[PDB]
């Protein structure tokens, strides 16, 4: 294995300081994240992360032509954070971030100025960090995209990206000092993974003829699952296959040859709305699968964290189960199951319940509730990979009439993370009649311990209603939103802005398997809801 491949392998795993400096505004706090603390960096190191990506948007911190000098306060803060991270023995990746769509995007019709600013930027950055450790690396530009004429991708685009990458390369390499063999990180167009984009990055790299170069791509999951639309509520075969194909060609093009790959950002697209957009068990299964295949293909990966994963005020994870799954996946595969939920109908004779495990080469070693092991043969059984909860255990763990999660059954395995079943006491969910305006519409809801997976919308004639007309299944959180703490389901202005005046049949799909029908009558800005 070469030096640069070992360099990149040594970065596994990595973390993005998202919506930090990259925020588009007066400074790094403009998007709601606090200023960076020493304890933030130290926490990221303590949690086992061995590298950090620091996205920076520069445009609003630049002086005028021709120097375009970077504001010294801002720049000193960025450098300080980088120093802190180097002190924690982290690898650091530094870039140009939103500048890509802010002012880089316009190269076809503004070439000379864009090249000028880009050059001034990477000159100042090259000079500032000339003496810094090789553990600090530069990436040319985040997610390069250019002005569209004949579609989102065209030939002059490829030329533009190659010119940016080449100019960047020569600025840094001519800077001298530690910049002479500083590892450089180059993106595919839009940091996407199409074979043609991969090939063109490959060609650029062969052109540069440099041993210290790293390819980078981004990945946010098979689109319909990642934003929960078109009925892709579960982590199923198409999502998996998209992962396999994607990183197969990434591996063949770069890793198979001498070029190491950094997955500079990953996550699920829907997280931009909310973490609650992807059902918990399905989310966990997605990340477990993904990181397994990245590991099998030696892809160093870096989690996108805009503030929603690590609580930066308390320096602990919002979702500990989630991070435990990531942490476990760094070392090897975890067993999962078909669901992280166990539903029991309240006021229905409690019976034995089967549960399909996905052992992934692991072995079940026990079950626990509240840290106490359950009884073999009195509380549960295991046939092959099929787990049975015995009726008496379920009875003991539950409370008649109390809907919701009554207990958490923890499955333990010889290797990997523990899997947590939520024992849900449910009743059939119920909706109520309502009246409202399109901008303030919410259906009163009796969730009864159940949770909304998705929602169909069709007109009375059977035609698909609302946004993304090509499917009946509407996008979670964009078109509708379960608000459990307020006992309601919101129907958004965005949904109503794209429906005719008509009867609209809504079908809510719940994770219990229940489906509830509901009817809207929309006229102008007013809507009537009928149970």
CA separation for the pair 111, 377 (Å, rounded): 73
Catalytic annotation present for 514: no
Beta bridge partners of 62: 70
CA 110 from centroid of its chain's CA atoms? 34
Tokens representing 251? 């591996």
Rounded to the nearest 10 degrees, the angle between the axes of helix 320-331 and helix 280-296 is 20
| N-terminal to C-terminal alpha carbon distance within the chain | 65
Which whole-number Å values give the CA distances from 521 to 84, 441, 529, in the listed order?
58, 12, 7
CA separation for the pair 318, 303 (Å, rounded): 15
Phi-psi region of 209 (alpha: psi -120 to 50; beta: other; left: phi over 0): left
Give the active site residue among 28, 88, 162, 265. 265
Identify whether the C-beta of residue 394 lies closer than 8 Å to the C-beta of residue 423. Answer: yes
Tokens representing 119? 């050059």
Beta bridge partners of 455: 474, 508
Tokens representing 485? 């703490």
Catalytic annotation present for 498: no
- Alpha-carbon radius of gyration of the chain: 26
CA separation for the pair 348, 465 (Å, rounded): 37
Residue whose pair of structure tokens reads 């026990």 in the numeric block: 366
CB atoms within 10 A of CB 107: 23
Give the active site residue among 28, 143, 282, 456. 143
Beta bridge partners of 51: 14, 91
Residue whose pair of structure tokens reads 């293909």 in the numeric block: 297
Residue whose pair of structure tokens reads 């999951």 in the numeric block: 221
CA separation for the pair 46, 48 (Å, rounded): 5
CA 426 from centroid of its chain's CA atoms? 30
Tokens representing 100? 């890509």
CA separation for the pair 95, 81 (Å, rounded): 14
Nearest C-alpha neighbor of 476 from the set 463, 497, 494: 494
What stretch of H or E contains 167? helix 155-175
| E strands in 73-121 | 91-94
Which whole-number Å values give the CA distances from 206 to 190, 200, 212, 255, 345, in the listed order?
20, 10, 12, 14, 62
Rounded to the nearest 10 degrees, the angle between the axes of helix 72-87 and helix 111-128 is 50
Q: Could you give the residue numbers annotated as active site?
A: 143, 265
């Amino acid at each position: 294995q070469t030096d640069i491949q070992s360099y990149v392998a040594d970065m596994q795993p990595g973390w993005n300081l998202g919506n930090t400096f990259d925020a588009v505004g007066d400074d790094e706090t403009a998007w709601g994240n606090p200023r960076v603390t020493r304890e933030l960096i130290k926490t990221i190191a303590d949690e086992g992360y061995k590298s950090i990506r620091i996205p920076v948007t520069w445009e609003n911190q630049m002086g005028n032509a021709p120097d375009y000098t970077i504001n010294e306060d801002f720049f000193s803060r960025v450098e300080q954070v980088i120093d802190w991270a180097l002190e924690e023995d982290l690898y650091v990746m530094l870039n140009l971030h939103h500048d890509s769509w802010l002012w880089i995007y316009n190269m076809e019709h503004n070439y000379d100025e864009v090249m000028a600013k880009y050059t001034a930027l990477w000159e100042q950055l090259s000079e500032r960090f000339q003496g810094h450790s090789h553990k600090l690396m530069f990436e040319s530009v985040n997610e390069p995209r250019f002005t569209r004429d004949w579609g989102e991708i065209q030939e002059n685009h490829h030329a533009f990206l190659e010119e940016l990458n080449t100019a960047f390369y020569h600025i840094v390499r001519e800077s001298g000092g530690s910049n002479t063999e500083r590892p450089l990180v180059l993106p595919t167009l839009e940091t996407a993974t199409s074979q043609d984009l991969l090939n063109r990055l490959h060609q650029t790299m062969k052109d540069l003829n440099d041993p210290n170069l790293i390819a980078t791509v981004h990945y946010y999951g098979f689109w319909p699952f990642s934003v929960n639309v078109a009925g892709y509520t579960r982590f199923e075969e198409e999502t998996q296959q998209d992962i396999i194909d994607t990183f197969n060609r990434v591996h063949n093009t770069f890793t198979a040859n001498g070029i190491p790959v950094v997955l500079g950002e990953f996550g699920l697209l829907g997280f931009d709305t909310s973490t609650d957009v992807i059902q918990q068990g399905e989310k966990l299964k997605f990340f477990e699968f993904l990181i397994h295949h990245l590991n099998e293909r030696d892809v160093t990966h870096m989690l996108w964290d805009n503030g929603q994963h690590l609580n930066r005020e308390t320096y602990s994870w919002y979702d500990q189960e989630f991070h435990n799954m990531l942490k476990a996946s760094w070392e090897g595969r975890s067993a999962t199951a078909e669901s992280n939920l166990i539903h029991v109908r309240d006021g229905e004779p409690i019976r034995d319940q089967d549960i399909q495990l996905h052992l992934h080469g692991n072995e079940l070693t026990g079950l626990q509730v509240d840290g106490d092991s359950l009884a073999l043969g009195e509380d549960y059984e295991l046939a092959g990979d099929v787990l049975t909860m015995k009726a008496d255990a379920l009875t003991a763990l539950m409370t008649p009439g109390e809907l919701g999660t009554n207990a958490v059954i923890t499955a333990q395995f010889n290797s990997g993370a523990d899997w947590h079943f939520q024992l849900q006491n449910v009743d059939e969910p119920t909706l109520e009649n309502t009246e409202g305006s399109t901008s303030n519409f919410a259906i009163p809801a009796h969730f009864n311990g159940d949770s909304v997976a998705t929602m169909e919308a069709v007109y009375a004639n059977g035609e698909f209603a609302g946004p993304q007309n090509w499917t009946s299944f509407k996008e979670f959180g964009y078109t509708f939103s379960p608000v459990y703490d307020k006992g309601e389901i919101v129907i958004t202005d965005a949904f109503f802005n794209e429906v005719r005046d008509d009867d609209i049949h809504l079908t809510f799909h719940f994770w219990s398997g229940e489906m509830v029908e509901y009817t809207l009558s929309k006229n102008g800005n007013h809507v009537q809801g009928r149970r």
